């Protein structure tokens, strides 16, 4: 029931390197999730 979102932002195929991801947001949602979708701007 906890939604964890970890984020990382960097200035630059996948770049070759190492970069740890710090935690960003913890949410007490408590729902069932099994599918997702992205959103775009036109």
């Amino acid at each position: 029931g906890y939604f964890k979102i970890y984020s990382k932002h960097t200035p630059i195929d996948l770049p070759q390197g190492f970069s740890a991801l710090e935690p960003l947001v913890d949410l007490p949602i408590g729902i069932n999730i099994t599918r997702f979708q992205t959103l775009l701007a036109l």
Partner: protein
């Protein structure tokens, strides 16, 4: 005949007895589910030695 409106109106007056006085009532029901419980009580913080 044999047909009545299901709702009756309370006729409250300031000179009625304790058995007819208007009482405002709130029922608080607390539920816990699989989701992380979030309705917490205030936590008193002791000064630090």
């Amino acid at each position: 005949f044999n047909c009545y409106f299901p709702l009756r109106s309370y006729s409250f007056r300031p000179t009625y007895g304790v058995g007819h006085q208007p009482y405002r009532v709130v029922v608080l029901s607390f539920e816990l589910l699989h989701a992380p419980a979030t309705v917490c009580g205030p936590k008193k913080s002791t000064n630090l030695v």
